[PDB]
């Protein structure tokens, strides 16, 4: 950052008869003075409830974007915002950040003292999971899906 550097006098004008002459001509190097700091505005847009189709529109003051797809990338949101007359050719950056993980819970009901069950996630379906499965058994079934991986 470019800065103004000032050197400013701190002279001793009443030196005692054997005090250091260097204090009569003392000047202090100031720290270096920066220009006005800018803070860039950030807003997080969340879309909730898992839409599977259609579009949304973003309002910027009084104006609205053209329709934006439910599946849109950051570059599609950026293109939609830069087309709005309150925003110019480099004035908005858009990205994804900050995951929240899904956490889901499963319970069996009734005196299910034997057999097997299946779980399904969208279109995919597990192998049969034992009525008395460990945490490892249920993880192995969930990891054997096509969308899920062993790290996930």
């Amino acid at each position: 950052s470019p800065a103004t550097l000032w050197t400013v006098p701190d002279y001793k004008l009443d030196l005692d008869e054997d005090e250091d002459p260097s204090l009569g001509t003392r000047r202090i190097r100031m720290p270096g003075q920066i220009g006005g700091l800018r803070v860039e505005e950030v807003q997080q847009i969340y879309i909730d409830g898992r839409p599977t189709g259609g579009t949304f529109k973003i309002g910027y003051g009084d104006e609205w974007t053209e329709p934006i797809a439910y599946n849109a990338s950051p570059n599609d949101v950026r293109a939609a915002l830069i087309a709005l007359e309150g925003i110019s050719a480099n004035d908005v950056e858009v990205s994804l950040g900050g995951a929240t993980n899904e956490v889901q819970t499963v319970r069996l009901k009734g005196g299910a003292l034997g057999g097997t069950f299946t779980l399904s996630l969208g279109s995919e379906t597990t192998v049969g999971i034992p009525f008395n499965a460990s945490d490892a058994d249920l993880q192995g079934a969930l990891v054997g899906l096509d969308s899920i991986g062993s790290a996930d």
């Binding site: 480099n90 299910a112 192995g140």
Partner: protein
């Protein structure tokens, strides 16, 4: 007491790890007072002092971590017992927001708070939107 004495891929090879009945909501026993004698109003009644349970918690992470996944649906058909069902719930819905950052000719400018019109979104459930300001531009 139903539950005490006195590898991830193992399930596909029949070496499943889940031994011993315990953590299950067992159906209440009945007792027959035949061949049993010497008293008055004889019966073999039973009662439960704590129901059995196991809630499996499933956490989706790494390559599954950003996604708002669909809810797991369970099929009970392979179980043997009196009245079976499988209960599933989302405890935390997933996601990853769009971060909009005002830059170049809007660097240091106090811009309007955005609003999102969701009327043309389709499918999903309680579909909605929220905008959270991380920084005022200044």
């Amino acid at each position: 007491t139903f539950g005490e004495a006195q590898f991830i891929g193992g399930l596909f090879g029949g070496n499943a790890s889940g031994k011993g009945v315990g953590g299950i909501d067992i159906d209440e026993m009945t007792g027959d007072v035949g061949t049993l004698s010497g008293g008055a109003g004889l019966d073999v009644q039973v009662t439960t002092e704590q129901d059995g349970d196991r809630l499996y918690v499933v956490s989706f992470q790494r390559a599954a971590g950003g996604l708002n996944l669909p809810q797991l649906v369970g099929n009970a058909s392979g179980l043997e017992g009196d009245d079976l069902s499988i209960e599933t719930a989302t405890n935390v819905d997933g996601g990853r927001p769009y971060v909009v950052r005002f830059t170049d000719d809007l660097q240091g400018v106090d811009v309007p708070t955005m609003t999102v019109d969701t009327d043309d979104l389709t499918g999903g459930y309680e579909v909605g939107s929220r905008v959270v300001v991380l920084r005022e531009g200044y």
